[PDB]
């Protein structure tokens, strides 16, 4: 009845997103640690990085503190092992990737 058919919208469509990540699991154990002493044997300033708390045998410890010791890797409950892999999406995502 009225030749209008203008509708709405001008340039807002595309396909939203749903293509930001979704990658198969590849990494596992971290190997980065930076430094913890006092730079080149200096003073005042010190390098401090990041290291989340992982559950090992019910005792709270750092994530990188356990990965450096092979004796504390195979001695843990299987329920905490699924969380050990999920925690790997921090240093593998901040660095490299």
Answer yes or no whether residue 8 interacts with another protein by CB under 8 A: yes
**23 or 59: whose CB is closer to another protein?**
23
10 sits near another protein (criterion: CB under 8 A):
yes
- Binding to another protein by CB under 8 A, coded x per residue (else -) over 42-71, reads -xxxxxxxxxxx--------x---------
Q: Could you count the other beta carbons within 10 Å of the beta carbon of residue 24?
A: 4
Q: What angle do CA 97, 65, 26 make, to 5 degrees?
A: 30
Q: Alpha-carbon Rg of the chain, whole angstroms? A: 24
Both tokens of 42, joined, read 């200096």
Nearer to another protein, 31 or 95 (CB): 95
């Amino acid at each position: 009845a009225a030749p209008v058919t203008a509708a709405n919208g001008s340039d807002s469509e595309s396909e939203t997103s749903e293509s930001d990540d979704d990658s198969p699991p590849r990494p596992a154990a971290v190997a980065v640690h930076k430094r913890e002493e006092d730079e080149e044997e200096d003073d005042e300033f010190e390098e401090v990085a990041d290291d989340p708390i992982v559950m090992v045998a019910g005792r709270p410890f750092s994530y990188s503190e356990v990965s450096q010791r092979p004796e504390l890797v195979a001695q843990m409950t299987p329920e905490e092992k699924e969380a050990y892999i999920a925690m790997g999406q921090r240093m593998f995502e901040d660095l490299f990737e």
